[PDB]
Design a protein around this ligand. Structure first.
Ligand SMILES: *[C@@H]1O[C@H](CO)[C@@H](O)[C@H](O)[C@H]1NC(C)=O
Lengths: 49, 48
């Protein structure tokens, strides 16, 4: 789902928030990004890269 | 006369402010301090 508060779980990585398609361009090997505060900010759909 | 001195006096302040980024030392510090504390306050989360 998108644009609704949910309890997402990515490859065991969990959390709560709203998921939208980003603009950031990871390197292919890079799995998922973060913030200055070490906080999760970006995810890569494992099934939808 | 005094007009010229005053009017010229203002002009320096512009350039005494235009380039010397250390002019606003105090204000920039206060914002700096608070920003850091929040980082420290946030960063404490990740500690067991
Ligand atoms: C499995 O994942 C890959 C890459 O994300 C995708 O191309 C493939 O089609 C997926 N399997 C199915 C049945 O869609």
């Amino acid at each position: 789902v998108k644009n609704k508060c949910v309890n997402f779980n990515f490859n065991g990585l969990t959390g709560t928030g709203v998921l939208t398609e980003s603009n950031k361009k990871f390197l292919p090997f890079q799995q998922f990004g973060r913030d200055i505060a070490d906080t999760t900010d970006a995810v890569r759909d494992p099934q939808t890269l | 006369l005094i007009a010229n001195q005053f009017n010229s006096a203002i002009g320096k302040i512009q350039d005494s402010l235009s380039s010397t980024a250390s002019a606003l030392g105090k204000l920039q510090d206060v914002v700096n301090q608070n920003a850091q504390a929040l980082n420290t306050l946030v960063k404490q989360l990740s500690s067991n």
